[PDB]
C-alpha cells in the first residue's frame, strides 16, 4: 500500500471504503477498494485477465498483513449520479439506447466466459466524457457473496435482484444480471425505479403487481421453489405500455424479454445485442460535469 497515495474517499462499497489513489511507480489515478480465504485469492485473480472494454479494468488484487485490496480503473462518474442529475430533463434516448448497448456488449463478454455479476445497480455502472459506461466489480459477488448489509451497515438494495433469487433458488445463472439490466433499463427511462422494494416479499410483490403474479403456465416449476407459498396473491400483469411510456415497441419488446419470469426464458445479452431497439444505435457524448 506504501506504492498508493490517497486523494480523496470516493464512497463506501459492499466490502470496504473505496478511495481515489495515485499509483506512484505509474503515476496512474485508480479506485483503491479495501475489501483472506485461498478461495477468493483464486477467484479474483482469474478476473484479472476478463479484460473488456465495457468492463472496468482490475488494474491489481494486493493481499497483505492479512489483508485484500483491490486496484480498479477509476471512473468519474456513476449512472446513479447521472441519473439524478438528469432527473428534470431525462437521459436523452439515443443515450440510454447507447448505454444499454454497451452493457449488454460487457454481460455479453462475461457470460462467455461463464462469469456473472450478480448485484448489478447504477452504483456500480462508471460513465466517462466519452459516452462510454463500464460493469464495476463484476464477479465480486462469487468471491465475497452478497451480504444483508454492508460493511456499514447499509441495506444493499434489492430493487434490481432478478425473482429467482427471491425465491430461493439456489443455483442461478447469468439471466439474473439481464433482469437487473432491464430494471436499469425501465429506470432510465422513466426516471423512477421500477421495483424500489424495502424488504424482499415488499420486493417479490412489487414485481407480482407489474408483471403477474407468475404460476406453472409462464414460470414452469416456480411453485416448488423454496420460498414460493400458494398464499401469494395473485396480481395481474400490466401492459408495458402502462409500464414504461414514452419507449417504443422495439424497447418494449426488448424490455418484456429482458423481464421474462423463467430464466430460461429471458434473453440472453448475446440475442439482446441483434434486437432491432438497436437498429439506429449511436454513440452520444453526455452531458456531464466536473
Ligand atoms: C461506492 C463505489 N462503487 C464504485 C463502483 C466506485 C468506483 C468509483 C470510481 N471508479 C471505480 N472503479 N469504482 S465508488
Known amino acids: 500500500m506504501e506504492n498508493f497515495q490517497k486523494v480523496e474517499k470516493i464512497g463506501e462499497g459492499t466490502y470496504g471504503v473505496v478511495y481515489k ?16 480465504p485461498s478461495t ?20 491489481d488484487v494486493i493481499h497483505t498483513e492479512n489483508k485484500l485490496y483491490l486496484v480498479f480503473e477509476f471512473l468519474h462518474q456513476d449512472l446513479k449520479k447521472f441519473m439524478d442529475a438528469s432527473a428534470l430533463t431525462g437521459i436523452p434516448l439515443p443515450l440510454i439506447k447507447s448505454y444499454l448497448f454497451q452493457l449488454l456488449q460487457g454481460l455479453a463478454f462475461c457470460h462467455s466466459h461463464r462469469v456473472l455479476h450478480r448485484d448489478l445497480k447504477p452504483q456500480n455502472l462508471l460513465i466517462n466524457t466519452e459516452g462510454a459506461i463500464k460493469l464495476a466489480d ?22 434490481y435482484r432478478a425473482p429467482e433469487i427471491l425465491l430461493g433458488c439456489k443455483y442461478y445463472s447469468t439471466a439474473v444480471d439481464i433482469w437487473s439490466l432491464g430494471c436499469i433499463f425501465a429506470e432510465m427511462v422513466t426516471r423512477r425505479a421500477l ?9 417479490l410483490f412489487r414485481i407480482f403487481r ?13 411453485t416448488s421453489m423454496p420460498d414460493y407459498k400458494p398464499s401469494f396473491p395473485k396480481w395481474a400483469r ?16 426488448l424490455l418484456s424479454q ?15 445485442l441483434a ?16
Open 258 to 272: 429482458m423481464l421474462h419470469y423463467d430464466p430460461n426464458k429471458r434473453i440472453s445479452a448475446k440475442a439482446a
Open 40 to 59: 477468493a485469492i483464486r477467484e479474483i485473480s482469474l478476473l484479472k485477465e476478463l479484460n473488456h472494454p465495457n468492463i472496468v479494468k482490475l488494474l
Open 195 to 203: 421495483f424500489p422494494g424495502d424488504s424482499e416479499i415488499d420486493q
Open 210 to 222: 407489474t408483471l403477474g403474479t407468475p404460476d406453472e403456465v409462464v414460470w414452469p416449476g416456480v
Open 21 to 36: 489513489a495515485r499509483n506512484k511507480l505509474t503515476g496512474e489515478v485508480v479506485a483503491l477498494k479495501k475489501i483472506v
Open 275 to 290: 434486437h432491432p431497439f438497436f437498429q439506429d444505435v449511436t454513440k452520444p457524448v453526455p452531458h456531464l460535469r466536473l
Open 138 to 159: 463484476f464477479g465480486l459477488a462469487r468471491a465475497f457473496g452478497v451480504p444483508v448489509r454492508t460493511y456499514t451497515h447499509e441495506v444493499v438494495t434489492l430493487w
Open 238 to 253: 400490466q401492459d408495458f405500455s402502462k409500464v414504461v411510456p414514452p419507449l417504443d415497441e422495439d424497447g418494449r419488446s
